[PDB]
Write a protein that holds these residues in place. Structure first.
Motif, PDB file in Angstrom:
ATOM      1  N   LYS A   1      26.972  48.531  40.227  1.00 28.14           N
ATOM      2  CA  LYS A   1      28.301  49.116  39.911  1.00 28.14           C
ATOM      3  C   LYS A   1      28.921  48.333  38.765  1.00 28.14           C
ATOM      4  O   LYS A   1      28.723  47.117  38.652  1.00 28.14           O
ATOM      5  N   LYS A   2      29.681  49.026  37.924  1.00 28.48           N
ATOM      6  CA  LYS A   2      30.336  48.387  36.790  1.00 28.48           C
ATOM      7  C   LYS A   2      31.584  47.648  37.261  1.00 28.48           C
ATOM      8  O   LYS A   2      32.535  48.270  37.742  1.00 28.48           O
ATOM      9  N   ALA A   3      31.574  46.325  37.130  1.00 24.20           N
ATOM     10  CA  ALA A   3      32.716  45.514  37.547  1.00 24.20           C
ATOM     11  C   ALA A   3      33.231  44.693  36.373  1.00 24.20           C
ATOM     12  O   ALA A   3      32.499  44.446  35.410  1.00 24.20           O
ATOM     13  N   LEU A   4      34.484  44.271  36.457  1.00 25.45           N
ATOM     14  CA  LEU A   4      35.084  43.472  35.399  1.00 25.45           C
ATOM     15  C   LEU A   4      35.355  42.071  35.911  1.00 25.45           C
ATOM     16  O   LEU A   4      35.023  41.744  37.052  1.00 25.45           O
ATOM     17  N   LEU A   5      35.974  41.255  35.073  1.00 28.89           N
ATOM     18  CA  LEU A   5      36.302  39.885  35.458  1.00 28.89           C
ATOM     19  C   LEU A   5      37.567  39.876  36.300  1.00 28.89           C
ATOM     20  O   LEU A   5      38.597  40.419  35.897  1.00 28.89           O
ATOM     21  N   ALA A   6      37.490  39.253  37.471  1.00 23.71           N
ATOM     22  CA  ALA A   6      38.641  39.180  38.368  1.00 23.71           C
ATOM     23  C   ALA A   6      38.362  38.231  39.523  1.00 23.71           C
ATOM     24  O   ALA A   6      37.227  37.786  39.715  1.00 23.71           O
ATOM     25  N   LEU A   7      39.394  37.937  40.305  1.00 19.44           N
ATOM     26  CA  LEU A   7      39.232  37.055  41.450  1.00 19.44           C
ATOM     27  C   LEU A   7      39.025  37.886  42.707  1.00 19.44           C
ATOM     28  O   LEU A   7      39.923  38.609  43.142  1.00 19.44           O
ATOM     29  N   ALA A   8      37.835  37.775  43.280  1.00 20.16           N
ATOM     30  CA  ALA A   8      37.485  38.531  44.484  1.00 20.16           C
ATOM     31  C   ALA A   8      38.428  38.210  45.629  1.00 20.16           C
ATOM     32  O   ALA A   8      38.604  39.010  46.550  1.00 20.16           O
ATOM     33  N   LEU A   9      39.016  37.040  45.554  1.00 22.31           N
ATOM     34  CA  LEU A   9      39.948  36.585  46.570  1.00 22.31           C
ATOM     35  C   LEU A   9      41.243  37.365  46.479  1.00 22.31           C
ATOM     36  O   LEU A   9      41.572  38.158  47.361  1.00 22.31           O
ATOM     37  N   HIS A  10      41.957  37.148  45.382  1.00 17.84           N
ATOM     38  CA  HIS A  10      43.211  37.846  45.147  1.00 17.84           C
ATOM     39  C   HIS A  10      42.957  39.309  45.365  1.00 17.84           C
ATOM     40  O   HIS A  10      43.754  40.028  45.962  1.00 17.84           O
TER      41      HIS A  10
END
Length: 26
Positions: free
Chosen positions: A1-10
């Motif tokens: 799946k196409k994902a971007l940069l981010a915090l999996a937590l938040h």
């Protein structure tokens, strides 16, 4: 799946953010 940069937590807290309103908002 196409994902971007981010915090999996938040990310969770984020889902939780709406999940909150969604649950809290009647």
């Amino acid at each position: 799946k196409k994902a971007l940069l981010a915090l999996a937590l938040h990310h969770l807290a984020h889902l939780a953010l709406h999940l909150a309103l969604a649950l809290k908002k009647a």
